[PDB]
Every structure is written in structure tokens, then in C-alpha cells.
Amino acid sequence: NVNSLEAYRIPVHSVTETGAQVFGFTLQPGADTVMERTLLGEILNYYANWSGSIKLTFMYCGSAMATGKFLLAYSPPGAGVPKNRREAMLGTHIIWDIGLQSSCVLCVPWISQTHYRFVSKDIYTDAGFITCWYQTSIVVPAEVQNQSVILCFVSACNDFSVRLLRDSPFVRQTAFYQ
Amino acid sequence: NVNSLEAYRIPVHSVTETGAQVFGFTLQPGADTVMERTLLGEILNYYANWSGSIKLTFMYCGSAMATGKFLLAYSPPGAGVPKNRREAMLGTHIIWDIGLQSSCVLCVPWISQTHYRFVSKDIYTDAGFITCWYQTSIVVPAEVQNQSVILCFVSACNDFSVRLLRDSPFVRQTAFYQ
Amino acid sequence: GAQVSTQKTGAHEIIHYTNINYYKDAASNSANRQDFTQDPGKFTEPVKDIMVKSLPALN
Amino acid sequence: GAQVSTQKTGAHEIIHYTNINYYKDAASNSANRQDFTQDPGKFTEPVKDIMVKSLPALN
Amino acid sequence: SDRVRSITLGNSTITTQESANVVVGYGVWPDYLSDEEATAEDQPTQPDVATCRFYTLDSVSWMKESQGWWWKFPDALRDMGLFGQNMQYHYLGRSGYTIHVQCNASKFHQGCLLVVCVPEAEMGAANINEKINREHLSNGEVANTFSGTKSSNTNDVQQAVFNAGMGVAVGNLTIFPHQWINLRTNNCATIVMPYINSVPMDNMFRHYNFTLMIIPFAKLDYAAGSSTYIPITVTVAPMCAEYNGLRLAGHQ
Amino acid sequence: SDRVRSITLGNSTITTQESANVVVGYGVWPDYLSDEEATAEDQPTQPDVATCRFYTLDSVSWMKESQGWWWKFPDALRDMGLFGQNMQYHYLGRSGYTIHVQCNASKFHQGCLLVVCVPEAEMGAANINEKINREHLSNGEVANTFSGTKSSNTNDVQQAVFNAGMGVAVGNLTIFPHQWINLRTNNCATIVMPYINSVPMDNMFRHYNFTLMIIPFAKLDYAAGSSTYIPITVTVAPMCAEYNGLRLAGHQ
Amino acid sequence: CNRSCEVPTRLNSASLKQPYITQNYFPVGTVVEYECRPGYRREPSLSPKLTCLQNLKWSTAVEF
Amino acid sequence: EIYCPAPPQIDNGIIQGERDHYGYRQSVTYACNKGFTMIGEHSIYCTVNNDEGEWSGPPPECRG
Amino acid sequence: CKKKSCPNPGEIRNGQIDVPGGILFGATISFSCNTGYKLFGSTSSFCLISGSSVQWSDPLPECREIYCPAPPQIDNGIIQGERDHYGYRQSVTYACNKGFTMIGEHSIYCTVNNDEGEWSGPPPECRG
Amino acid sequence: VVRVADTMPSGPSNSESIPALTAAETGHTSQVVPSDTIQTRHVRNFHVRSESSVENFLSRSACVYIVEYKTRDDTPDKMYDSWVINTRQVAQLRRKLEFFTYVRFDVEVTFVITSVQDDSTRQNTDTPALTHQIMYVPPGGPIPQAVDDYNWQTSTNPSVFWTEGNAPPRMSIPFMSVGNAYSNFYDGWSHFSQTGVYGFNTLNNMGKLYFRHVNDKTISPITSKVRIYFKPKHVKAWVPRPPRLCEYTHKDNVDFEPKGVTTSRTQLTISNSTHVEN
Amino acid sequence: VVRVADTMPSGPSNSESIPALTAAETGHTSQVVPSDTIQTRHVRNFHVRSESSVEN
Amino acid sequence: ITSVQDDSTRQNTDTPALTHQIMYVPPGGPIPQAVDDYNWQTSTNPSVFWTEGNAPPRMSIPFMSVGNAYSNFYDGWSHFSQTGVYGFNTLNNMGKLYFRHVNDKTISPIT
Ligand SMILES: CCCCCCCCCCCCC/C=C/[C@H](O)[C@H](N)CO
Ligand SMILES: CCCCCCCCCCCCC/C=C/[C@H](O)[C@H](N)CO
């Protein structure tokens, strides 16, 4: 789905059993493959240190008759990835009720021991995990499409900062362009 | 007529049909062949940018019994060269009546999108066209010579400016002069 | 005709430097690496009828 | 014995420079590239009985 | 001297050195329509200097036996730049006019012209109870020509100079704003017509506002050796033009 | 409620009842060129409300597997009444724009659109080192259409949605003034672009100012029995337009 | 004896396939193709091909 | 379309750019040879009188 | 001396001519046909030398019109106003007979992919 | 800072004021502002006639000449060189200075010295750094005749020494003239009887430069060439003059081949292009 | 010297004030301070957006 | 600027210090066609000389553009008829640099 517009479409539908899940990735805006080539991640790859909070916005692009609740959760590192919904509700979560305001904001705060983390991968500055959980279900009436799509956004807060100018690991040149 | 004083003599006579024409050139004081080796054009060839308005003065050097009217017109670029007198009267023109004041002034203003144009030729800073039209005719009495001569002058206004010192493309040397 | 500014220094623990311009053109001067202002209100919040962020901002 | 002038700069958006003369002769000094005055009234309009430019200036 | 006049409109300028007195209108100068005499309700288009400027029509040749020429002026300016373009997109329009007629000769020449602006010059047909084609009334920027004898072309205007097309004595046409171009002393044919109608705005195509006529009363006459080709050039400007009722492109 | 908005320009008015917030520009409102940043010397033509009004472009049909459409807006308004006529007679011109994109469905429908105005969206060619025809960049009021797979039509634009023609990540196009038409809740696609260029006035034909793109990220999806034909209508207005350098009629 | 390129760019994770690994004389417009070395695996977002350009130098080849 | 007839040739003189057909409002300009002097107007033009093509005047003449 | 000028290339009907560097000796012009139109012949000419003057190296090319093939007939349903030829951006609207129900989109339209006419999707179907 | 003049707004006009009708017969350039013929707008213009001043036009490091001399020649005359100082053997600075009839300035003078090893059999050497002497001889002084002449001992004449590898030599020179200004053009004779030499050659009288290697005769020939770069500064100029059309032929007169006025055309009117097709 | 913005302390909340529920459909980036969703503490932050300026 | 002695038979020399010239030609000026061309005499064109072993050459250049700013992207054509060249290549127009050795022809090649 990389070679399509399906990379941005997160599937959501009605599930025959709750306690479930939707997705998850690792909070590394410039090391993780998910938010690597994003606007924040490409500004952030010319640097080598970062600091501050990170926002996540989830636009539910489904029908107006559809409704449901989600569990948007952040887990600081030190333990593993949570495997249940009840392990992920011990973290920093918000329960999102879909309604007339079709989007919500998960704010990932700055929980660290150092003032800075590396924009590349080291084990000393691990940053946590972001998971989303089917909490209840998707409930639709008759003659309404069950399978809908969530879109996820990312940006930075007003306390975000970058520090060490380096060259980006994505530019590559073999010969002069002529 | 380059190798004579006939380069400066513009012919004018009585024409058997009006709606006509007299001459025309391209407003490039240092690129166009007409005003290339002029005083303004030779000051202007040591530079590479110019700006400001340009004057044109037309001394009618004919008899004192001769009379007639002309259409002195400037056409900003974007369309082609006008081919009628009615296409050239859509521009910036003045109608010149020959009388006791034997000369008139066509003032070419600064109609541009940039502050500067190049004194050499590029397509991005085209500057327009200068044409003169038999509007009516030359009317003379008996035993008076029909064929007379217009002289054209050029100078610059009080808002004219030149910018980039370069060497002139007209100096050429092969060996030392001894 | 010198001018004295502050040096970039650490926090939680005002050193000055001096500067003289030697050339007649302003393109010759050293680069201005000490302007830290910003205004991200034309890219974020680029709307009409400015929102409140506590109201629903709809209906 | 220094002297402080203004640098040549752009318009629509007063920077100073300093100058010291080191040699005893005035032919040694740097060139005066900042005099922008003019008076084109001896080459243009070089006549007697100064015209008005709105009158016919004849008869 | 008062023989010299400059006239500046838009990006166009006319200089004359043998003017006599610039003739100008019924005493009234053109001005935009007030909102106390107005009828249409939407905002007018006072376009710019892009219409209020001089346009040069075609030249007619004055020979020894020429009789007279005429134009119809809201219709003659129908392909003259953005002015004509506004005519094709609006329903109602309104303007005064600065007409400047030029003609020159030498001092060994003789002959006299009459230049009249006639409002509502409704022409009569050559054969009596028969229609007139529009191409015989107004031919755009191209002049129609009077004759000396009575004319009998089909679907055409009765063109005798001594009745001026309308059916009056041609020496009585000095009741309208006019001048003379006596080749002894003139070139100053202005007539700055105001807007003259019986309604505050009008359609440019369906109505002709006035008619310019250039009739030589003392014919052109010269000795052998002088210039035999003497053109007459008519230049015309709209003044305080405005437009109303914008819709699709009109009737060509 | 703040879901309702009226927009009045000239003799045209748009009412919407499911607006969300009318999106408008870089924070800057369009205004006429000041005479302290001006370059050209003759008097500008601020024409009237005759250009500052809404024009409706063609409608494109949003199917289940549609990918995206684009326009080039100084060039798309080239036959839209007197606006386009001023483009053909002047050399320099300048305007902001009020773009209002409309699209509607029912509450049993789902799907989401992105509406971006991109300044200087220089498109890349399908085959690499080869010219592009002008008809493939801008087709007037008629939209060009992106694809899903890479394209290899000769003298044509590389049209993949996931690179947006320009060669970037398509999720990064929210850096430009934009909206979303989520069919759950929207119709309010304004973008009131100011004049954005690197020169105070520019040519309308030789330069394209910006590019409107309507890309569905969450595709249109409905159950059997709903209306399958869902059009998308784009309406566009010039604001504070002015024109300069009048000459003969231009390049069609 | 036309113009020819050099040996294609030696990558530390890919080797040439086997019409191209032996033969010299690469003219202009020649495409060559790489395979994953043992033991590596393909990255699907990159196409492992190299075109030799007009100036007798290959296109940029980084890590396939 | 109404046409004037063929324009009359003058003695000792030619027509500058003689067209094959002459419609309404169109003129012929008469030149004159070396050693001859024009008399009268240079050009006559085409008229319609009684729905009939007709030249407006007599052609000029060159004496010398 | 100075360069000679080749003749003015003029126009291609339903195509462009791109003249980046004038039409002097040693120039290059390029050729491209519009949307829905296909180029047949030459893509470029040079202002070469020909005898005692300069001429263009290739003759003027031609822009033929691209057509999608005949639209597929659906079972139990006709086409509203079926045209004989279908060019670019043009669509067929499928109707449906009495006693039958449409499934899917009504209309498909004509596309060009790899310089080739092609309908955009499958035609619909009427079950009843 | 002296900006250029601005454009003022105007409107319609119908009066006996005629700025377009002038008399060019009275030696007089008309001063028609563009707001007098067309209707203009208010333009606040911020341009400066800065880089068109005579200082900013002439104060660039121009040149005058190239000079060649060797360090091992069998003939003793090619071991040093000399140059009688004028500014009229290179056409660019000559034409630029001959825009004006009188000039008055100081000169900043720079030398650019480059040495090339000549061709010989024993071409593999170990040569130390060459050292050059540039001696100026004022008008009338004694001239050297060899490289080991004792006239090079520069006790009163100003001379400059230079070592290979450093910054180039540069020195300033005041207004060294006997009149009130320099003469670009002199319409007269040297003798009172209107005989002798004609033109500007009577007034040059600047003395001359002499160039040698300070080192002794090397074991392999090396040719050195020094380029004299003249650069005027502190400039005043009087009674301007048209730019020259024809090409220069010699350095001591103004003699020329008659060249036409400009480049030709094929016809006196313009039109649209008649090349290839649509 | 223009430091980055600080974090303010907060507490429990039960009201009709909803900073998390926004509309991303209005071209608008939400400006949720981290003290609006979780209970935070007073952080006096001393970081400078210095080396991210367009000159630097 | 770095120089490498090329490969030849007579490779043992005694070469003095190389001197370089970098001449800038503004857009429209005359171009050199050889190393002994007289267009290198830099009377109005700015040129920089450099000797082997010193600090590298460095000079400052003002905002040399005809518009109000530089353009990274241009969505338009060179000709008014929407033909010609497309993109940012219409607006480059910076002139060009020319590079030579000030010395005469050596007895061994050095690149
Ligand atoms: C040891 C270094 C001394 C260098 C001496 C070289 C220059 C000394 C002579 C003065 C230069 C005069 C400049 C040219 C004079 C006038 O401009 C010309 N006659 C042109 O009219
Ligand atoms: C003798 C030394 C002179 C050196 C001259 C070299 C540079 C002179 C040219 C000016 C450089 C312009 C910098 C690049 C311009 C813009 O950024 C590009 N168009 C990118 O948009």
C-alpha cells in the first residue's frame, strides 16, 4: 500500500468481539518507518536531537450514521508493547467517542530523563509506543457501509525543539545532474 | 544607407491612399540595430540593466507650405506588431500636426512588471514596438517639392537608470596598437 | 564605530562581544545568526472567524 | 581620528562603517564611490532666455 | 499663441499647431450619470482609461469632386479595443465623445469643410417605401459617401448632398455643434458631445446616438504641381463611459 | 449556527448551510497594489465588479475509483466573461481569488476530499527528459486527472496520486492553504488566496500562479440503492483584480 | 568502438545478475539490473536498475 | 457580388499592383513612366450607381 | 559573417511547436500533439544546411485523433444516445430495461493510457 | 542618497498648454515628464543613479600592457624590458577614457608577474625564488642599457622589488601632470610654426618603466611576463564627447578606417515574422 | 532570547470544555497544550529554537 | 583549488608555483575561446587570481536578481504563446565562470 493512497487509509469496521485493537507504531518521528517521510520527520532528519511534545489527530472519515468509541493510548518505555486492551489502559490514553466533532487529539507529552532524545535509533533514548484499540465496535444501520477509514495526522507542540545540524540520510547522488 | 547621411533621413511624401504608415522599430536601445550606436545606446551598452522612460523627438525638415498629420505610436508587448493603423491606435499614441512648431515629442513610459530590463536580448524583458503612421497625407502647393524628410531624436527622461558594469560588445582588439 | 552584543551562552548557570564593520557594502557583513523570533500564526490557525479551542467550534 | 559613514544598502526594507587614513598623502586614500549628486542643466537646457515647456517658446 | 492645443486622454495625446478654437458641445461637459436621474439598480462599470482614449478611424480621400462622408458613432467604435468589448458584454451603456477631425494641406491650396455632429440623424431611403439595410446606414469604421445627383440603389439611403440624407436644406445644418476646416486657417475640429438621449442609459447596438458628417461646401482646388492626394483623418474618444447589465457576448 | 455562510461578490451570491469554517488564505486578505511597491507607470485599470464575481467551471464526476483532478487558475478563467477579455488586452495583471468548492451527498454516504491551492506547482513529465504540451498542464476550464499507477503517455505529465505530479509525499500537501470535504460534515471550501508572486504584477498567460487539486484520501463508498452519481462543482472568483499595459488582442 | 561506460557501481549488498556480470561494452541507455546478495532481501520501495547516461556515468545507485 | 469592369489603361503609364477583380470601395493607383508627367488625381475608385459597377472618374494622363 | 535563418515553421494543427533558441543555423525545434491526439512522424527538426541556403531537416508531422473502441453492450440494457465515435473524456450512459435493476455506476468514460484508447472501468449490469 | 525623480498623478486635459510641441531647432532637449502626455499614477520611485557616476564608471582595475623579458639570453637586450607610459595601446580603457576630453585623477597601479620555464635540454633544475625589479624613470632621467648596469641602483628613482609567491605589487601615484588636467585630445602641433608632430603625442611625457630579474644569470632560460594594470581613482572629467565608432589603428594618432553608422536592416518598416509556419 | 513556551500545572476536570474534540476539516491545526488532557506539573523550560531558524 | 601532476615519461620536473585565474562573466558579456585569448584581460569583468599554497579565495556577492526574490520554482513558459521552455530555466540568467592557469604551457601536464 506504499505505492497508492492506501498508505494513509487506516481500516476500521464492525468486529464480532470487543476488547480489540486497531493499530500501533513506535514513537520515533524520523527513525520509525511510519512517520519517517512526514513533514515533521523530514524537518527532523536534518537534525540529531529533539525535545518536546507531539500531537496526533484522527479524522474519522466514515458515514454520519456510524458511531463508536476508541482507545488512543501512549505507553512510556521500560516494559514491552502492551498485548491487551487492559494493559494499554494503564498508559496515557484517551477514549474517543465519534460524533458531530469527527476528530480527536491524542497529546503525547514529554516523559523523559534527559532533555533531548536522538532522532536516530539508540537504546538509551527509547520513547514509547502508540496504539489504538477497538474499545467497543462500529455500529451502523441497514444499507450503510460497514468498512470505513481513519486518517491520522501528526504535528508538534509549542515546546518542540531541534538541535544538531546534520545532513539528511535520504538525499543520495551518484553523478552530477545535467 | 548606412555608409551615408541617408541613415538619418526618414522619407515622407504624399501618398495616394491614407490609413498608411511611415516606419517602425523595436524598443531596444542597445539591442535593436536602429538605436544601437546612439549616445544613449553606447552609454547603455556598458551596462546590463536599464529602467525608466524614453523620449523620441521628430523634427519635420520639409517646406513651410507643407502640412500633414502623423500617428506616433508605442505598443506594449504581448501581442504582435500591429499591421493596421487601427491596431496601432489602441496603444500609446499621439497625433502630430505639422505647423509652426516643427517638432513633437513621443514619450514612451515605463510599463513593465519588473523594475529592470536587460540591455541585451532576452524574451523575458520584451519592451514593445514604435511605429509611425501616415494618418492623413502630405499636402503641398504647386512648385513645391513633395518628398521631404523627418529626423528622429532619442534621449532619456529624469527617471532613467543603469545598473551592471560590463564591457561593451563593440570594442575589439587583435594586437597592441603601436 | 563598534557595537557590543551578547554571546550565545547556556542557561541556569551575558558575556559580550565586539564588532566592527570594515567594508562599504552591506552584503559584506557577517551573517545574522541571532534572531530567534517567530510567528506561526499564518500557517497554523490560518482561518477566518478565529476559534476558541474550548468550544466545539461547530454548530 | 576615525570617521563613520553609512553603507550602501537596499530600499523599502543606515548600517555604518568605520574608516581610518593611514598614510600622509591624500592620493593614498580609498576612492570616493558614494557621491551621487548631478546637475544636467549645462548640457540639456544649455540656452539663453530660459523656456517654460508649456508655452510654444516661439513667436 | 492660441493656435496651439494639446488634448490628453488615457495613453493618447493629440497636438495641433493650427487650431482656431477647439469646438466643444452644447455648453455641457460630459459627466457620469447621477444617482438621482438613474434607473438601473446594479453597480455601474466605470471601466478605466481603457475606454476613455482616442481611436483612429479609416481615412477618406478628398478629391476635387468628392461630396461628403458620414459615420454612426456608437456603432463605429464597435471593434476599437476594450471599448467595443464592453459593448459586446453589457446591455446598457453611456458616454460622451471628444471628436477631433484632422486634415491638412499647403498654403497654395483652397477648399472648405463642414464638420457636424447631428443627433438622431434618421436617414431616408433612396426608393421611397422600401427597407434600408444596416450596411448602408452604418458601415463600422468605414465611411458611407453622399452623392451629387439623387441615388436609386436598392435598399439604400437617399444620398444627395443638398438634402443631407435627412431631407433638409444643407445650409441649415449649422444649428448642431460644428466646425469648418477652412484649409486657409484650420484644423481644430473638436466637438465634445455630451450624452444626449431621452433615457438615462441606452443600448449601443440597437440605437445610434449621432452622426458625424464632413461635407465640403467650397470644394478642394489646387494648381498643377501641388500634392493631389489629401487625406482626412477622424479621431474619436469616449468620455465618462459606463456600462451596466453584464451578460453573455452580444450581437456581431 | 455557524454552519451557515453567505458570500456576495458582484452580482453573484453563494449560500451554504453545511459550512464548517470558511477557509481563507495565508492570513492575508487580497488588496490592490500599493504605489510604494509598484513598478509600472501608467494608470491601472481597476475594471469593476465586472471581473470580481463568481464563475463556475465544469463538473467532474466522483466515482469509486477516481483519483484526483487539477486546474491552473489564471489560465482556467480565460474564457470567463470580461475577466478573460481583460486578459486578452492587457500585458500585466494581478488578482487574488476566492475559491469555493462545493460537493454534496447523503448521510448514508462516506468519503473524504482534500482541496489544496498550491503556488507554483511545476509538474513533472511522464517520460523524463521530454517536453510537456500545454494541453496536458492546463486544459482551460476542463480538469486533468491523476492516476493510480505511473503514466507513460507521450508529452504528458507524470500523474500518480502518491506523488501529486510534483514529486513529493501527497500527505505533505497540507502545508498549503487547504480544506477537507468530509461528506460527513462539510462543504466550506473557501481558499481566499492573495496575490502571491515574486514580482508586483505578472502576465496571465505566460505564468501560472497556483494549482487547485481535489484528491480523495478516503474514497467514495456507498451501499446499493443510494445515488451513484455524485458531482463536484468548483466556483472561483477574482478579487481586487487590476490590469496594466493595454495593447492589441492577445494569445488564444 | 563506440563510447562505453565503466564497470557498474559495486554495491556492498547487491551483485549483478548473469547476463551482465561478465560482459563489458555498456553503450548509452543501457539498463543493468542487480540482485540481492546472500544473505539479503529486497526493499520493495526501490527499483534495482541503473541507466548509463550521456556523460558515460551511471545513475545513482545506493542500497537496494 | 458586384464588380466594377476592367480599369481603363492610360497612355504611357501602368497600374501599381493590378488586381484581377475590383469590388466596391476599391481603387487603382496609376503610376507614370520615366519622362512623363502626371495630370490630375492618381487614383480612381469603384462605385455602385443604379445597382451597377462603375469607376468614379476619368483616368489620368501622362504627357511628358 | 552572420548566421542564416531557416524559414518560419508556422503551425501544426492540433499540436505545438517549441522553439527554444530561435530559428538560426544550428537550431532545434520540437513537436507535440494535444490531449486526445497522437503524434505521427517526426518529434524534432534541425536547421541544417541544404544546398546554398538552410532548411529544416524533417517535414511537418501530423496529429491524428485517438479513439476508444466500441463500447461494450450490457446484458438487458441499452445506451442512451450511442455515438459512432468516442474521443477522449467522452462517456456512455447506460440505461436499463423495465423489470431490471442497475448495479454500480451508470456511466464509464474514455481514457488514454500508453497512448491508447481505453474505457475507464467495467460496464454495469442489470439483474432484475 | 539622491533617488531618481518620481512620477506624479495626472488626468484629462483640454487646454492651450502644449508640452509635446517643442522646438528642437534651439539646441534644446525637451524635458517632457511622462505625466504630461498620458494619464499616470503615483509612483514613488526608489532607484539611485549610483553606479553610473564617473568614479563608479572609471574606478575599476583596468590594464595597460604586457611586458616580456628573459633571465638567460645570448643577446643582452632581451634580458630586461622597458615601456614608455601611455594609456593607448589597449582599446577598452582607451575608449572609456576618451568618453571625456579632459580628465584629472590619481592612479592605483598593480603588477601581475608570471614566469614560464623555457625549453632547453637541461630542463630539470632546482631553482630558488625569482626576484623582480620594476624601476620607474621620470621624464628626462638616465636609462639603463644592461641588466648589470649601475643605473639600476635606484638612489632617487622609485623602484619596487617583488619575490615570487607573494601578493602582487600595488602602489598609488598622484596627479603627475604639468597642466591643470590630462588631455585625451590635443588639436595642435609641437612647433610654433604649425609643423612637427600633430595630436596628443606632444603632451604624453610620462617617463618610462624598466623591468629586470634581480637574480644573476640562471643555468636555464626562464621568461617572465609582467602585466601593468592601471586603475584610475579620485576622478574629475570635463567637456564630454561622443563614443568612438571606428576601430583604433595606432597609439599616437586618431587615424581610422571609415566605418558605417550602425548595423543594416532589410526594410524601413517592421512586421510580424515570416518564418516557418503555424 | 526567546525561550520555548512553558508547561503550566493543572488538575482534574469534569466540564463541557472539550479541547480534544476538534475539527480538522477546517484546515486548522489544533493547539492542544499538554496541560489540557493530562494533569501536569510546573515545568520552567529553558530551550531556545535557535539553530532551527532559516539563517541557521 | 587542488592540482595533480598527470602521467608522462618526463615526470621529474622542478615546477614553480601555479597561479590561477577565475573570471566571472555577467549575463550577455563576451566569452573567452582559448587560454591566450585577450578576453581574459578583465578590465570590467571581476576576476580573482590565486597562488598555490595560500588561504582559499573567498568573496561576497549581493542579491543579484531582477525580481524581488529568487525563484526556486516557476510554473510557466518562456514565450507568451505558452510554447518554448517550461519551468525554472527561464529565470536563471546568472552568467558564467571561466577558469585557467595564468602560467604559460608547462613541460609536463598538470590537471
Ligand atoms: C615603480 C612604480 C612606479 C609606477 C609608474 C607607472 C605610472 C606612472 C605614470 C603616471 C600614469 C598617468 C596615467 C595616465 C595619464 C593620462 O590619463 C593619459 N595621458 C590619458 O590622457
Ligand atoms: C570572480 C568571482 C565571482 C563569483 C561569481 C559566482 C556567483 C555569482 C552568481 C550569483 C549566485 C546566485 C546564487 C543562486 C541563485 C538562486 O538561489 C538560484 N536561482 C536558486 O533559486
UniProtKB/Swiss-Prot annotation, chain H:
Organism for this UniProt entry: Homo sapiens
Summary of the function given for this chain in its UniProt record: This protein recognizes C4b and C3b fragments that condense with cell-surface hydroxyl or amino groups when nascent C4b and C3b are locally generated during C4 and c3 activation. Interaction of daf with cell-associated C4b and C3b polypeptides interferes with their ability to catalyze the conversion of C2 and factor B to enzymatically active C2a and Bb and thereby prevents the formation of C4b2a and C3bBb, the amplification convertases of the complement cascade.
Subunit: Monomer (major form) and non-disulfide-linked, covalent homodimer (minor form). Interacts with ADGRE5.
Domain (Sushi) ranges: 2-64
Domain notes: The first Sushi domain (SCR1) is not necessary for function. SCR2 and SCR4 provide the proper conformation for the active site on SCR3.
Disease note: Complement hyperactivation, angiopathic thrombosis, and protein-losing enteropathy: An autosomal recessive disease characterized by abdominal pain and diarrhea, primary intestinal lymphangiectasia, edema due to hypoproteinemia, malabsorption, and less frequently, bowel inflammation, recurrent infections, and angiopathic thromboembolic disease. Patients' T lymphocytes show increased complement activation causing surface deposition of complement and the generation of soluble C5a.
Parent sequence residues shown: 222 to 285 of 381
Post-translational modification remark: The Ser/Thr-rich domain is heavily O-glycosylated.
Annotated disulfide bonds: 4-46, 32-62
Protein name: Complement decay-accelerating factor
Gene name linked to the record: CD55
Tissue: Expressed on the plasma membranes of all cell types that are in intimate contact with plasma complement proteins. It is also found on the surfaces of epithelial cells lining extracellular compartments, and variants of the molecule are present in body fluids and in extracellular matrix.
